[PDB]
Assembly symmetry: D2
Homo-oligomer: 268 residues x 4
């Protein structure tokens, strides 16, 4: 009956009820999965959000820049799911880039310390989480990360585009490691969705250009997408992540699935 | 069932090893009601499809025959009932004359041979979509079979060119299908022992067929981080069923790789 | 001269706006000795090729005509003199019937029309390489013209499919050409005002031809970091001459984009 | 006469006479270019090596991680070429990755501080040099960087593959900035060449397998390449860089030219 019945899945990246990770968790629970959630920094606020999910799920703290949190993660997950049990899926829905690396801030003015922090959180941490969690994953398992197609340069995304290009490369090497465990590793390249990162990181960096730039982004995406695109609806993206967490894409690994309305395949 | 209540047309069954046979079997296991299409050997195809878990009507369809295409939607509507439409369409059809394959020199394939292969293998994806889109429901899905042609390779020769054209046709079919709320995608599969692999590819390789196919399988399984078994079409069938389902609703004009991850590695 | 001493065959001249006319002009300015091929209206084509800076023999070549292809190497050898070989070949040929283009419905193009377009626009790149590789020197270069078909777009319709096929053919021609020490590559150009743009692409757009080309050009120039001028074929002709030269000796089966960098960007 | 007659070009990345940058400089000088060279750390060795070039060229110190070197670079180059003169070309031929990020060292065991150093030198510095040098470049100018095709994961290249994926993305954004000055930015993806980085960095990280792994790489590359490939010959790569520095690829920017014998377009 449920697409993920009997599956134990770790979902990182919930910060608000608009987070892509919130919708992934909601859809996964609706489909029978038992979740373990991870949150960063504002744990009291995150628990208030995760209480809105269909079912209870333990929340563990994880700052991906914190070596101690990573070294303890597998043990804390095992305590949450019970000794002897393993995870079937892991969702990396994490990203960050300082303001200097985004929007109308000049591309050449982002200092390396800022870009490095963004690449650490947005790309290297996909390898860090796989390293910590592969030893407690079952064969047939699935690791999924979130991508924003960085094949071409574009306005505002700036250094986050470089971090996503690095993340696509990391995913191909993580697939080589995960294959030793019978585990798949893939990214879902989503179209634009109204989340806290889009408003607070992207929107805040666009300044007086946010209104026009985001309208043109939204309109162009919906126009290029042969089936349209609704930036207010994360459900099609959440369903796609759940398809990769399921047993229905068993031969796909080190790859990118586009949940973008088909926009990347069209010029206009 | 993943496809409960869905009405899906599946083309391309010729034997019980056909990729379409496994797609049809998995779709039926998942609750789909099928309409099947077959080319030329209707008596053999009926005997083969009697091995599927459930009954399904078999319609004749030669994609080079304009009359078959012009009458196809009406014949499908008769099989599924007036007022009912399809939710899914699977194109699992290919052909290339021997001159366009194997050890036969690339430059020696005459255009009449290449053209026949492009007609059946690439243009017909647009033909089947033209015939069936008027009888598809919104939220529907059209899926075609691909073999990654982004880089030249031994033996695949002109079939590589037909698949490159098929990928381009798929992106334009997605533009037309979107007007109906329908998705169009290809599944690029790794190598599977089928009649086309043995008769068409192996036939054109001559004395080197066994050795070249062994080298292809071993190399594919090595490159693929999760391995690859050419004797098992089930992972490819499951991937097609995922695209026919409501679980990839935002993917269109695209290519899903069901190849063990081989295309992403060296 | 970049091409001093080189003997190069250039197909595809029909008007003095043809991308092939500008490739031939820049190649002659750079010291190359040319052999030209033309289709159908050879008397008219000779009057156009008389506008080039230097004389060049003009040969008839309809790429759908097996007899023309079978005699081509002998006719080229007669034009350049026995004992000499070609260093370069330029394929700057394309055609698609109206049904396969513009506002005409993508599904209404009959296969006979699409097949004719694929024959002329893609298979012929393999035909010309088959006919001419036997009379090419090591270090030589075959160049074809492409229009980036990696993503679908309005109006280009079935010509996009033909260019996707041409890209795949080019990778296989590189395998054959490598046996002769010859490179094979395509140049994916941005939009240039030529007879095919006006008569074929524009012809199939009905009343929207002007609006569509102006919007295509504006968007292309905006997206291209160095800009794009659709009235100037010289940057494209120079790129083809770079591939015909000895300065890209390790590039084959590939695509070089002379499009202002538009394909690598979004606006 | 010369392909680069009258052009003033800065060339970074010479360490030995096998460096790709040494062959780029030699071919550029044979084609009439006037060079300014930059070197890192081993200036006494670099000066002796550059004395083997066909013509004299000033050598300037440049450590791309040193902010003071980058801030003074344009003034130092202007002093070398004369006030009132500007550069027509810039060649970035710089790369580094700590041993943990390469060879048989496990992908997951490379600490972020090591990956970050490698990404700083190998990818971010392409944007650093463009920021420093664009104010002193003429319209019609050209910036070229060196790439190794990272579109697919492969043995041994490990985190350097991630740095090159990031560099390709950086190049597309440097093209947007360089276009404001009428300057092109592109990468050359070269096949394998026996250089100090190949022997000391890649070979060093392969341990006891260095000889066999490099032999298989060379043999396979030459087999896949329709026109073949010679790892002992950097001249085809140097000529390709000179073609991009010339006026003969005037409409190509934010792009990647493959000087790899055509290997990337084939399977065998
Ligand atoms: N919203 C979009 O349009 C969109 C599109 C494509 C891809 N994505 C990607 O989806 C993912 C989720 O982003 P979102 O849009 O849902 O925004 P969001 O703000 O809801 O989520 C971003 C998450 O990253 C977490 N994070 C930041 N630093 C962290 C750290 N040190 N350790 C652990 N977690 C950390 C934040 O706490 C937050 O939960 C990101 O990878 C983003 O790049 C988003
Ligand atoms: N077998 C593989 O390794 C493999 C891998 C990737 C993709 N594919 C693709 O999968 C598809 C199915 O091939 P397969 O391997 O299952 O082989 P198969 O021989 O089982 O199927 C090929 C089918 O094409 C049909 N066909 C041929 N001419 C036709 C026509 N005129 N009208 C209608 N149908 C026609 C045949 O009747 C047959 O059913 C093809 O598109 C093939 O290129 C196969
Ligand atoms: N104009 C553009 O914007 C543009 C952009 C990118 C690529 N291209 C490509 O450049 C090439 C040249 O086109 P153009 O734009 O210069 O237009 P054009 O009309 O000047 O040239 C097209 C040429 O194809 C020739 N041709 C047609 N059928 C032929 C046949 N049977 N045999 C031999 N030659 C035949 C015509 O005679 C003509 O010389 C084509 O491949 C085209 O697709 C054009
Ligand atoms: N050798 C190959 O097979 C090959 C193939 C493709 C691409 N490449 C690329 O070509 C470029 C040149 O490498 P190579 O193979 O000639 O090796 P090399 O060892 O000759 O050159 C590497 C250079 O990087 C310089 N460098 C390192 N850290 C630096 C810093 N902090 N500041 C400034 N310069 C610094 C070194 O001083 C050296 O000159 C690199 O980007 C490399 O990745 C090499
Ligand atoms: O990327 C663009 N603008 C910025 C942008 C991207 N997005 C989507 C998104 C939101 C939040 C994300 O999460 C994050 C987390 C942490 C840190 C930074 C982002 C994220 O990864 C992606 N929303 N706004 C544009 C692209 C574009 C493409 C085609 C044509 C025109 C275009 O115009 C644009 O403005
Ligand atoms: O493609 C290759 N060889 C030929 C080949 C392809 N296949 C898979 C297949 C079977 C039948 C197919 O169906 C059809 C139907 C109708 C008409 C032609 C084929 C089909 O499309 C694809 N099996 N053998 C090779 C690729 C390769 C890649 C990497 C390294 C080495 C390689 O070596 C190869 O030999
Ligand atoms: O009208 C459009 N596209 C059609 C097109 C293509 N070209 C360039 C070209 C010319 C002649 C060619 O030569 C040939 C020769 C023989 C046979 C067909 C074409 C050729 O290959 C390519 N010019 N117009 C578009 C309108 C648009 C408006 C706004 C934003 C984006 C857009 O994108 C479009 O692509
Ligand atoms: O990448 C590979 N091995 C490692 C490798 C790469 N290269 C070429 C190179 C040398 C030095 C470089 O400069 C640098 C500078 C600073 C820091 C690291 C490297 C560089 O960027 C690239 N030589 N050995 C392989 C690729 C591969 C592809 C197809 C089939 C099999 C394969 O097997 C391989 O072993
Ligand atoms: Na749309
Ligand atoms: Na494997
Ligand atoms: Na569906
Ligand atoms: Na522009
Ligand atoms: Na070779």
């Amino acid at each position: 009956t449920g697409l993920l019945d009997g599956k134990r899945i770790l979902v990182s990246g919930i910060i608000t009820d608009s987070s892509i990770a919130f919708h992934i968790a909601r859809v996964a629970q609706e489909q029978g999965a038992q979740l373990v959630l991870t949150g960063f920094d504002r744990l009291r606020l995150i628990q208030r959000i995760t209480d809105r999910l269909p079912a209870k799920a333990p929340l563990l703290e994880l700052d991906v820049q914190n070596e101690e949190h990573l070294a303890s993660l597998a043990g804390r997950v095992t305590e949450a799911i019970g000794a002897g049990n393993k995870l079937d899926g892991v969702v990396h829905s994490i990203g960050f880039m300082p303001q200097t690396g985004m929007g109308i801030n000049p591309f050449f003015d982002a200092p390396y310390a800022d870009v490095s922090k963004g690449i650490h959180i947005s790309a290297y941490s996909y390898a860090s989480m796989a390293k910590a969690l592969l030893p407690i994953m079952n064969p047939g398992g699935s690791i999924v990360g979130m991508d924003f197609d960085p094949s071409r340069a574009m306005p505002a995304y700036n250094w986050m585009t470089v971090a996503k290009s690095a993340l696509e490369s990391v995913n191909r090497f993580v697939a080589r490691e995960a294959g030793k465990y019978g585990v798949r590793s893939n990214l879902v390249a989503a179209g634009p969705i109204r989340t806290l990162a889009m408003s607070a990181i992207v929107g805040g960096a666009l300044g007086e250009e946010a209104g026009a730039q985001i309208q043109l982004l939204e309109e162009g995406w919906d126009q290029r997408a042969p089936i349209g695109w609704n930036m207010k609806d994360a459900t099609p993206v959440a369903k796609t992540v759940c398809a990769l967490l399921s047993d229905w894409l068993p031969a796909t690994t080190g790859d990118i699935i586009y949940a973008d309305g088909g926009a990347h395949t069209q010029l206009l």
